[PDB]
Amino acid sequence: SRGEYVVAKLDDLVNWARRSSLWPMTFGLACCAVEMMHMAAPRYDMDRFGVVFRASPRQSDVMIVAGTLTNKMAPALRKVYDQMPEPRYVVSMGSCANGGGYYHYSYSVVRGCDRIVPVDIYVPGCPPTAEALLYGILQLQRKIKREKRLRIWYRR
């Protein structure tokens, strides 16, 4: 159908822009944040792919939870995630963000940031290498490429 083709082209265009322009929030908690610095470093430059750190959550699309999430920190993480405007994606990085990691059986550690925020991509490691994090970011981009919001809406 002409309308189906038009909406397919439109939501391919929309997904391309969001895929190609990712603005992670400047948010690092622990040693896993050093590998984010090494990804931003010249060797594995994230700026090539359209990935640019922004301080404000209002101007951010992706939240990279890289570090141990504690009970004292969880409200702040939830607050900044809520203040991020939609569409918003979450990449948990390292063992601490994925599950508990080395501190899973601890009184002051949340066993996974997925108990607080909906996580889209999980990157395993302690810490994940810069290449591993870049692979996770590209996998998130490929996940965005498959979203069909206008195609869902047209048949809604």
User: Residue numbers of the site for ligand PLX (CB under 6 A)?
Assistant: 9, 12-13, 16, 19
With residue 121 as reference, give the H or E element that holds it: strand 121-123
Q: Is 104 in the site for other proteins (CB under 8 A)?
A: yes
State which of positions 23-52 bind other proteins (CB under 8 A).
42-45, 48
State which of positions 37-66 bind ligand SF4 (CB under 6 A).
none
Phi, psi of 78 (to 5 degrees): -65, -40
Please classify residue 102 by burial: count the beta carbons closer than 10 Å to its beta carbon, then call 0-12 exposed, 13-18 middle and 19+ buried: exposed
Note the Cα 6 to chain centre separation in Å: 29
State which of positions 101-130 bind ligand SF4 (CB under 6 A).
101-102, 126-127
Binding residue per annotation — 32? yes
Of these partners, ligand SF4, other proteins, ligand 3PE, none, which one is at the site of residue 31 (CB under 5 to 8 Å by kind)?
Answer: ligand SF4
Q: Is 156 in a helix, a strand, or coil?
A: coil
State which of positions 114-153 bind ligand 3PE (CB under 6 A).
149-150, 152-153
Distance, first Cα to last Cα, the chain: 15
Sign of the CA dihedral 107, 75, 82, 102?
negative
Residue 85, number of CB atoms within 10 A of its CB: 11
Q: Is 21 in the site for other proteins (CB under 8 A)?
A: no
Residues of each annotated binding site for [4Fe-4S] cluster: 31-32, 96, 126
- Binding residues for ligand SF4, rule: CB under 6 A, are 30-32, 67-68, 94-96, 101-102, 126-127
